[PDB]
Design a protein around this motif. Structure first.
Motif, PDB file in Angstrom:
ATOM      1  N   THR A 109       0.841  -1.191   0.000  1.00  0.00           N
ATOM      2  CA  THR A 109       0.000   0.000   0.000  1.00  0.00           C
ATOM      3  C   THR A 109       0.883   1.251   0.000  1.00  0.00           C
ATOM      4  O   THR A 109       2.090   1.185   0.233  1.00  0.00           O
ATOM      5  CB  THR A 109      -0.946  -0.005   1.197  1.00  0.00           C
ATOM      6  N   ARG A 122       5.483  -0.209  -8.259  1.00  0.00           N
ATOM      7  CA  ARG A 122       4.662   0.834  -7.656  1.00  0.00           C
ATOM      8  C   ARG A 122       5.532   1.899  -6.999  1.00  0.00           C
ATOM      9  O   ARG A 122       6.457   1.589  -6.246  1.00  0.00           O
ATOM     10  CB  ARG A 122       3.697   0.270  -6.625  1.00  0.00           C
ATOM     11  N   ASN A 171     -15.575  -9.468  -3.237  1.00  0.00           N
ATOM     12  CA  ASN A 171     -14.903  -8.353  -2.554  1.00  0.00           C
ATOM     13  C   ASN A 171     -15.087  -7.094  -3.388  1.00  0.00           C
ATOM     14  O   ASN A 171     -14.568  -7.008  -4.500  1.00  0.00           O
ATOM     15  CB  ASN A 171     -13.422  -8.634  -2.343  1.00  0.00           C
ATOM     16  N   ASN A 218      -4.769   5.709  -6.260  1.00  0.00           N
ATOM     17  CA  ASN A 218      -3.850   5.075  -5.304  1.00  0.00           C
ATOM     18  C   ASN A 218      -4.597   4.393  -4.171  1.00  0.00           C
ATOM     19  O   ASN A 218      -4.156   3.350  -3.677  1.00  0.00           O
ATOM     20  CB  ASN A 218      -2.869   6.101  -4.751  1.00  0.00           C
ATOM     21  N   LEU A 219      -5.731   4.960  -3.757  1.00  0.00           N
ATOM     22  CA  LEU A 219      -6.591   4.286  -2.793  1.00  0.00           C
ATOM     23  C   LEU A 219      -7.112   2.969  -3.347  1.00  0.00           C
ATOM     24  O   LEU A 219      -7.158   1.957  -2.635  1.00  0.00           O
ATOM     25  CB  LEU A 219      -7.751   5.201  -2.418  1.00  0.00           C
ATOM     26  N   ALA A 261      -5.732   1.091  -5.670  1.00  0.00           N
ATOM     27  CA  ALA A 261      -4.608   0.166  -5.660  1.00  0.00           C
ATOM     28  C   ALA A 261      -4.376  -0.418  -4.263  1.00  0.00           C
ATOM     29  O   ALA A 261      -4.123  -1.623  -4.135  1.00  0.00           O
ATOM     30  CB  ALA A 261      -3.356   0.871  -6.196  1.00  0.00           C
ATOM     31  N   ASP A 262      -4.453   0.417  -3.208  1.00  0.00           N
ATOM     32  CA  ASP A 262      -4.323  -0.082  -1.832  1.00  0.00           C
ATOM     33  C   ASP A 262      -5.375  -1.142  -1.510  1.00  0.00           C
ATOM     34  O   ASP A 262      -5.082  -2.146  -0.843  1.00  0.00           O
ATOM     35  CB  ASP A 262      -4.463   1.052  -0.814  1.00  0.00           C
ATOM     36  N   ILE A 283      -4.578  -4.543  -3.498  1.00  0.00           N
ATOM     37  CA  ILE A 283      -3.442  -5.305  -2.970  1.00  0.00           C
ATOM     38  C   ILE A 283      -3.632  -5.633  -1.487  1.00  0.00           C
ATOM     39  O   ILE A 283      -3.208  -6.703  -1.020  1.00  0.00           O
ATOM     40  CB  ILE A 283      -2.124  -4.538  -3.236  1.00  0.00           C
ATOM     41  N   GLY A 284      -4.284  -4.754  -0.726  1.00  0.00           N
ATOM     42  CA  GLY A 284      -4.469  -5.005   0.695  1.00  0.00           C
ATOM     43  C   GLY A 284      -5.575  -5.991   1.027  1.00  0.00           C
ATOM     44  O   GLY A 284      -5.459  -6.754   1.993  1.00  0.00           O
ATOM     45  N   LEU A 285      -6.643  -6.007   0.242  1.00  0.00           N
ATOM     46  CA  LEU A 285      -7.853  -6.744   0.583  1.00  0.00           C
ATOM     47  C   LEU A 285      -8.312  -7.706  -0.501  1.00  0.00           C
ATOM     48  O   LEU A 285      -9.316  -8.407  -0.298  1.00  0.00           O
ATOM     49  CB  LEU A 285      -9.009  -5.772   0.886  1.00  0.00           C
ATOM     50  N   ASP A 286      -7.635  -7.753  -1.640  1.00  0.00           N
ATOM     51  CA  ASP A 286      -8.050  -8.615  -2.744  1.00  0.00           C
ATOM     52  C   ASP A 286      -9.416  -8.156  -3.261  1.00  0.00           C
ATOM     53  O   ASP A 286     -10.264  -8.960  -3.658  1.00  0.00           O
ATOM     54  CB  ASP A 286      -8.059 -10.098  -2.313  1.00  0.00           C
ATOM     55  N   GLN A 304     -12.034  -6.988  -5.827  1.00  0.00           N
ATOM     56  CA  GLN A 304     -12.179  -7.343  -7.235  1.00  0.00           C
ATOM     57  C   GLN A 304     -12.858  -6.266  -8.074  1.00  0.00           C
ATOM     58  O   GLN A 304     -12.694  -6.265  -9.298  1.00  0.00           O
ATOM     59  CB  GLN A 304     -13.000  -8.624  -7.385  1.00  0.00           C
ATOM     60  N   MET A 331       0.097   1.400 -13.045  1.00  0.00           N
ATOM     61  CA  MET A 331       0.720   0.625 -11.979  1.00  0.00           C
ATOM     62  C   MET A 331       0.874  -0.825 -12.419  1.00  0.00           C
ATOM     63  O   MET A 331       0.281  -1.249 -13.408  1.00  0.00           O
ATOM     64  CB  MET A 331      -0.119   0.737 -10.708  1.00  0.00           C
ATOM     65  N   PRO A 332       1.673  -1.619 -11.703  1.00  0.00           N
ATOM     66  CA  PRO A 332       1.796  -3.037 -12.055  1.00  0.00           C
ATOM     67  C   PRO A 332       0.433  -3.721 -12.108  1.00  0.00           C
ATOM     68  O   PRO A 332      -0.513  -3.325 -11.424  1.00  0.00           O
ATOM     69  CB  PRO A 332       2.680  -3.599 -10.934  1.00  0.00           C
ATOM     70  N   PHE A 361      -0.907  -6.320 -10.978  1.00  0.00           N
ATOM     71  CA  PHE A 361      -1.596  -6.890  -9.823  1.00  0.00           C
ATOM     72  C   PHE A 361      -2.254  -5.833  -8.915  1.00  0.00           C
ATOM     73  O   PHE A 361      -2.818  -6.203  -7.884  1.00  0.00           O
ATOM     74  CB  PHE A 361      -0.652  -7.799  -9.012  1.00  0.00           C
ATOM     75  N   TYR A 362      -2.225  -4.543  -9.268  1.00  0.00           N
ATOM     76  CA  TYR A 362      -3.046  -3.551  -8.579  1.00  0.00           C
ATOM     77  C   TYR A 362      -4.348  -3.257  -9.306  1.00  0.00           C
ATOM     78  O   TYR A 362      -5.173  -2.493  -8.783  1.00  0.00           O
ATOM     79  CB  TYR A 362      -2.286  -2.225  -8.398  1.00  0.00           C
TER      80      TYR A 362
END
Ligand SMILES: Nc1ncnc2c1ncn2[C@@H]1O[C@H](COP(=O)(O)OP(=O)(O)NP(=O)(O)O)[C@@H](O)[C@H]1O
Ligand SMILES: Nc1ncnc2c1ncn2[C@@H]1O[C@H](COP(=O)(O)OP(=O)(O)NP(=O)(O)O)[C@@H](O)[C@H]1O
Ligand SMILES: [Ca+2]
Ligand SMILES: [Ca+2]
Lengths: 291, 293
Positions: free
Chosen positions: A157, A170, B123, B223-224, B226-227, B230-233, B235, B260-261, B263-264
């Motif tokens: 994050t 990132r 999710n 950016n939120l 993306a968080d 990656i943080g919570l999966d 979808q 971004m990559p 996986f975000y």
């Protein structure tokens, strides 16, 4: 209930029988490196032979990410020949008992949660600050793992949109300012070079430059904790890892958190169940799933 | 199943019977302002009387935070005399049917989630970007609300540790960089002053300074997201609110996310169920709770 618990790391594979939360019949072998994919099938066959008949269920903790029984990673190259290894399927070749899989930081989270007062603590996060930063998240007393095993990657994050670039691309993640690797990226450029352990020693002696570097890490972890509290209603955060447990580090984390408005506060404590955390955490989680 | 659905806003209280996601018997009154606490007890008595016998259960959406049936807020200023108002207990004085309560953004999240394919989307996050930034989070098909109703306050997560101070005291929150209020804090200082709506018009004509201001907001929301991925999966993310739905805004959000990559990345779409979102989302959620126990 008797658990065959496996802990598959980058270097060693630990196995054991866990019953009533007690370890017995430990065993540790090297994680396959030569012809790793073919070798791992042999290794797993041999482990399931050694403990045959001695378990009601299997619980596997592994580094990386478990996606529908397959071993993977954010960058699957970090797994070498074990990238995409069909872990649950290979174990299932040699047993009909139920098999649960989770990753190592998730298992460590469960190790630190299993002895909590679950009446009082239902939203719980484990953060390891080590070479990198990893997490495991438990909400309403259940570990997050669906759908693809990614939940808990809070090291990726955002910490600062003007911060260093993280491993996979990132810009500004927590990992690139808070992890031991990020500390060393700065301290190794000092004249003369220092390791993170040496930077910490200087920080504890009030070296202002070393202190600024440790504060950069602790502040990022504090802001991550605040995000989890306000974003998820997290009640408790447990911090482990060699950086997380370094003398003076967690107190600095808590000082940064405490200067934020009180509704970002929560219980913050050091990990205390690191010993065999993978084995004990995986056994507890899989047993809990079975209900 | 018949739901008496209440949507308690800053200025209006909407009520209706919801039966199989269909709305009937609308009433809309003003949110009590004089002697608010005393008056609200009267209002709720009156509403429950008007609808008596017509509902199997009650579902209440309200602005602010629901903490164990009580109305609160991060700063109870913006609730006035309804700060700490005992909403569930007050309604329970007039009915013995089950009563479920959730906040207005959580209800809007459920309104947007109820018609998703629940097999393929478990999710799910709803983000409203309007005057402020609010969220509702659904994981494994269930809205997060425990223990104290705070889950989903993602406008108060970090956007920039060197950014502006948020309304309630935290340095660098998403809200202080991305919300309509944050846009206007900058555009009102232009010579001459502009509102956010005017800043957006200029942004669509490629005014570089206005564009910079809109990008600051869109990048922070990206950016939120993306968080959350990656943080919570997470979808799928659905974005609403007057800023969130402004023409050009969500494409900019998605452009920032896509650099971004991989996986975000996740599915990102505009809100489509804004109409009666409070009533319909609360009705659906309380029914879902009842079904599952
Ligand atoms: N006493 C220490 N104090 C502070 N940092 C340390 C300390 N020991 C190691 N580190 C750093 O923490 C990170 C990992 O340390 P170490 O535990 O020795 O490696 P590892 O255990 O093999 N990998 P990991 O699984 O991440 O812990 C590195 O950045 C170290 O420089
Ligand atoms: N078409 C628009 N485009 C961009 N911004 C807008 C637009 N309309 C309104 N805004 C701004 O978005 C915020 C809310 O606008 P508006 O929806 O009219 O009030 P509201 O209904 O009280 N919104 P909210 O309370 O946050 O649900 C303010 O910052 C407005 O300046
Ligand atoms: Ca990355
Ligand atoms: Ca705040």
């Amino acid at each position: 209930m008797r658990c065959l618990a496996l802990d598959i790391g980058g270097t060693k594979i630990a196995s054991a029988i866990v019953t009533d939360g007690k370890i017995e019949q430990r065993q540790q072998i090297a994680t396959p490196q030569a012809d790793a994919a073919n070798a791992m099938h042999d290794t797993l066959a041999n482990i399931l032979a050694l403990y045959a008949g001695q378990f009601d269920y299997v619980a596997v903790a592994s580094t990386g990410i478990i996606n529908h029984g397959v071993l993977t990673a954010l960058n699957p190259k970090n797994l070498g020949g074990l990238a995409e290894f069909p872990l649950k399927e290979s174990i299932a070749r040699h047993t009909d008992k139920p098999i649960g899989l989770l990753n190592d930081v998730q298992a460590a989270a469960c190790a630190e949660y299993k002895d909590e007062d679950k009446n009082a603590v239902q939203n719980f996060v484990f953060i390891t600050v080590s070479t990198g930063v990893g997490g495991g998240i438990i909400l309403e007393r259940r570990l997050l793992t669906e759908p693809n095993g990614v939940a808990g990657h809070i090291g990726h994050t955002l910490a600062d949109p003007n911060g260093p670039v993280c491993g996979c691309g990132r810009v500004g993640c927590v990992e690139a300012v808070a992890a031991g690797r990020a500390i060393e990226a700065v301290s190794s450029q000092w004249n003369p070079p220092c390791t993170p352990k040496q930077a910490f020693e200087l920080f504890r002696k009030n070296d202002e430059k070393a202190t600024a570097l440790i504060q950069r890490s602790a502040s990022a972890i504090a802001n991550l904790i605040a995000d989890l509290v306000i974003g998820l209603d997290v009640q408790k955060v447990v911090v482990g890892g060699s950086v997380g447990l370094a003398e003076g580090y967690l107190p600095l984390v808590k000082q940064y958190l405490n200067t934020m408005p009180h509704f970002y506060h929560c219980t913050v404590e050091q990990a205390r169940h690191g010993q065999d955390a993978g084995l004990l955490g995986a056994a507890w989680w899989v047993a809990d799933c079975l209900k």
